[PDB]
DNA sequence: GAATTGTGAGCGGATAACAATTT
DNA sequence: AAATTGTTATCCGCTCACAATTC
């Protein structure tokens, strides 16, 4: 797989894959830390939504 | 506009998603008479295959 | 035993729901 | 009960295998 997954960012962050997911949507239940961190990982990591899989969860961003 | 799946495709040609797929993919293991009624069904619902989820569930196929 | 066909697990990721724990 | 973080299954659309069926 060329383009990196939530996954990956959930892994390099050092969180739960959920907590990945939950930055993501801004959830209140995210610390600032904790959100900070998985944002931050997606530099590192390159992110770039898997528009394969995302479209198939929902959509090709969110 | 909205999109369309191999569910639809299935509900509206009176058989199984698998059958739907069978007739996309167009393999052995179908016969023709389903086959002519499932691509009649994406006709009339306009189903548009995802390469993406063909992708997903295809390890390197595109 | 194979063509047909249905049911399901899986891919791959994102979310909903939930559970342990602490407050 | 709610917050944090984690854990699990489901769900999306699609594909393949296997089981059951029928011949």
Redesign the pocket.
Same mark, same amino acid.
């Given at each position: 797989?060329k383009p990196v =997954?939530?996954?990956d960012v959930a892994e390099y962050a @050092?969180?739960?894959?959920?907590?990945? $997911?939950?930055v993501?949507?801004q959830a $209140?239940?995210? $610390?600032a830390? =904790?959100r900070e961190k998985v944002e931050a990982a997606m530099a590192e990591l390159n992110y770039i939504?898997?528009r394969?899989?995302?479209q198939?969860? @929902?959509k090709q961003s969110?």
């Open positions: 797989m =997954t939530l996954y @050092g969180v739960s894959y959920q907590t990945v $997911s939950r993501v949507n $209140s239940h995210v $610390s830390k =904790t939504p898997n394969c899989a995302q198939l969860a @929902g969110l």
